[PDB]
Structure formats: C-alpha cells, structure tokens
Design a protein around this ligand. Sequence first.
Ligand SMILES: Cc1cc2nc3c(=O)[nH]c(=O)nc-3n(C[C@H](O)[C@H](O)[C@H](O)COP(=O)(O)OP(=O)(O)OC[C@H]3O[C@@H](n4cnc5c(N)ncnc54)[C@H](O)[C@@H]3O)c2cc1C
Length: 295
Amino acid sequence: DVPVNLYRPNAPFIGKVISNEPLVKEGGIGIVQHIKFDLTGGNLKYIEGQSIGIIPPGVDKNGKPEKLRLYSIASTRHGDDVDDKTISLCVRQLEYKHPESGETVYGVCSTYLTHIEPGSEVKITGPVGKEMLLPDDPEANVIMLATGTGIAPMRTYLWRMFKDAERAANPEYQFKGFSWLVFGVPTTPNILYKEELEEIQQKYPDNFRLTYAISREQKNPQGGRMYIQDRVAEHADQLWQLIKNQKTHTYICGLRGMEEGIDAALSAAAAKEGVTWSDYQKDLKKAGRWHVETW
Ligand SMILES: Cc1cc2nc3c(=O)[nH]c(=O)nc-3n(C[C@H](O)[C@H](O)[C@H](O)COP(=O)(O)OP(=O)(O)OC[C@H]3O[C@@H](n4cnc5c(N)ncnc54)[C@H](O)[C@@H]3O)c2cc1C
C-alpha cells in the first residue's frame, strides 16, 4: 500500500526544520540546499520516488495566499538518519532575469526554503506521486538519467540500494542488479552529493556505474559543451541493450526538455535492430518501466 495524501493543503502537517546545508561547493553556479525536516508528532509516511508539497508564507502579487510547490523527496522512506523520523528535500533557489530589466528575480517558495533556519515550522503536504516508484525486485536494472535537482529521486533509490544502514534496515531488499546514473550539471562543484555517489561506485563497482556530463569542463565530439544527451548518445547502444531486459526500469528526472535529446539517441540505437524507439517506449510506459518527471 503506497502512502498518498496523508496531509492536504487545507490542513498541512507542521514540520520543523532540522538542518539546511549547501550542496553547491565553492566555484559552482547557483544555490542548491539539502533540507531535512522533523516529522515526529505526525503520521506522514512516504516511499522512494515520491514528492511532498511545501506552502510558503505570504501572499502573491494579487494578495492571494501562496499555493503549495511540489518538491521531489531526496531521502529514503527511513530518512537520512534511518530512524523513520525525518524527510529531506534537494532545493534549488530559482533565479532568472526579466526581459530588458537587468535585475534578478527570485522564486518565492525556493528562496524561502533555501534560506530557512533550523527550528522554523514549515507547512508540508503529501506525499504524492506513483510514477517514479522503484521496483521491489532486487534483481531489476535501474538506469537513472538526471540533470540538476533531478538527482533527488535518484538519491532515494541509490541510498536504499547501497547505504550500509539501509541494507541493515531493509532485509527484504538487498539489491543485486545493475544501476547506472548519468548525471548532468555545469561544473564539478555542482555535482550534488558527489562524495557519497563516488563512495557508492567504489564499494559496488559491479552494481553501480557513475557517468558525468559537465558542460563547463567537457566538450562533446562535435566541440560543443557536454550535456547529458551527449553522454546518452555516447553509450546509446549499451543503454538500449540494458533497456531490452524485461526487468530494467529507466528514470528521467530534472530539467524540462531533457527528454528530447535522450530519445533521439536511443532511437538511433534501437533503429539498428529494426525497432522504433517511440513505439517501444510507449509499451515501456504502459508497463510502468519508463518513468519521467521534469519541471
Ligand atoms: C513533481 C515536481 C517535482 C519538483 N521537484 C523539485 C526539486 O526537487 N527541487 C527543486 O528545486 N524544484 C523542484 N520542482 C519545482 C518546484 O515545484 C518549484 O516550481 C520551484 O521551486 C520554483 O518555485 P518558486 O516558488 O521558487 O518560484 P515561483 O515564485 O513560483 O516563480 C515561478 C514562475 O517564474 C517564472 N519563471 C521561471 N523561470 C523563468 C525564466 N527562466 N524566465 C522567465 N520567467 C521564469 C514563471 O512564470 C514561473 O511560473 C518540482 C516540481 C514538480 C512539478
């Protein structure tokens, strides 16, 4: 039984911030924070791949109360401390420039969150979502294609799969399949959770492969900046081969529009064996083995 909407916008759970730490190292672009909330006092439960809503304080330009913003859960069902008492988010502060203005605009909910102080009460809703769930089969293969904060659900899968404390807590899920994360960010300092991701690959070289697409530090064969679609094209045949397995699941998460280049690359690979990717993909989606969530 997948937990869903234990709390709703009309009566959200009031959680308390425990910690708020920077994920972007010096020399990186933008601000992305790892924020953990205390769930004690309530009955909010969740599983990997889901999201929760956050209702920021204040009113919008029209004087109306701000609505909730959804955020991908970044922690396993047990929380970062494996105590079933918390939940974490991976939040980027939205920033952009206005047309012919010159001044930076800051997102309401993301700025509120990235600068929130420990001890502060936060309105939480959810959890929600059933399209990014991880299979219970410990023999399944999991391809993870992420950009930016799209790394959030991937962290929940990878932690449950490879963290010592998680394995000790989940006797029913001892991952033995193969997982491959292709992560695209602009700089090395922007590689969210770099240290831990690399520790996992070192400990499980036969069960986890980590591939980076660093735009400001790498160039693709055509001379352009390296993006995730370039890495997918680079390993298109291998990825297609893994995708043909009845037990393989693929997850796409992050920047809206990242799907197009990925499909073009896989389409070229599948075509070599007389397969139309777009059609094969449709069946995968219907079977619940092709998961996508972008924003
Ligand atoms: C399922 C789901 C999961 C999500 N997961 C995450 C996550 O894990 N981490 C995360 O950081 N975010 C995530 N998001 C995005 C999140 O919900 C918010 O939309 C985001 O934080 C921005 O909200 P805000 O309140 O800060 O911005 P707002 O104050 O709501 O401003 C947003 C508005 O700014 C304008 N705008 C935005 N960009 C530009 C631009 N480039 N040029 C001109 N105008 C622009 C648009 O009109 C837009 O509607 C997720 C969204 C969904 C739907």
